[PDB]
Design a protein around this ligand. Structure first.
Ligand code: GDP
Ligand code: MG
Length: 179
């Protein structure tokens, strides 16, 4: 079986840990974990061959900036996340996450992931953003950002509803196999 390492990065509260949990497990207890602290793998078949993906979670808050690069050695694919309910998290993609990953993971493919797709049409989300004259991220803004940062692709998903999640890991596997 082919062995590849995936790392997930992005602002806090954007759904990173949930994305890793929903694709790897059938049940998760009632506990909040900042990062997956157990060895989670994704077993994916692509083009008629079996790939095993080690999934490495990170903490996006600034207090962790100094220790986060311990997760980067020998990465084969990056999932770089923002949340569709947070325009601020999208702004941090070119400003923080892109230069950090390009430094520690040179030439490693990046999948830009717009998480929490279910909140784009959520009434409560729309009201909370609207009160500050904001709105959910539009798909065209994510495509534009993937062009700006040189990502391998842009995908949207919801760890909550599961929509789009399998496709994220399949494209990440395809990307990891190119090099
Ligand atoms: N509505 C919605 N909430 C989500 C989704 N994914 C995660 N969440 C919630 O967002 C919060 C943060 O998720 P988490 O995975 O801990 O984010 P992380 O800080 O990036 O690891 C939690 O309350 C999750 O239950 C989603 O697709 N839709
Ligand atoms: Mg987390």
């Amino acid at each position: 079986a082919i062995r590849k390492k995936l790392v997930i990065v992005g602002d806090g509260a954007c759904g990173k840990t949930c994305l890793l949990i929903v694709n790897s497990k059938d049940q998760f207890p009632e506990v909040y974990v900042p990062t997956v602290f157990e060895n989670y793998v994704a077993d994916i078949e692509v083009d008629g061959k079996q790939v095993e993906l080690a999934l490495w979670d990170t903490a996006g808050q600034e207090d962790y900036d100094r220790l986060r690069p311990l997760s980067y050695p020998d990465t084969d694919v990056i999932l770089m996340c923002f949340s569709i309910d947070s325009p601020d998290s999208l702004e941090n993609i070119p400003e923080k996450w892109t230069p950090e990953v390009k430094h520690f993971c040179p030439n490693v493919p990046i999948i830009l992931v717009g998480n929490k797709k279910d909140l784009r049409n959520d009434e409560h989300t729309r009201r909370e953003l609207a009160k500050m004259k904001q709105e959910p991220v539009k798909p065209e803004e994510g495509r534009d950002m993937a062009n700006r940062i040189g990502a391998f692709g842009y995908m949207e998903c919801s760890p909550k509803t599961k929509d789009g999640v399998r496709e994220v890991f399949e494209m990440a596997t395809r990307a990891a196999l190119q090099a």
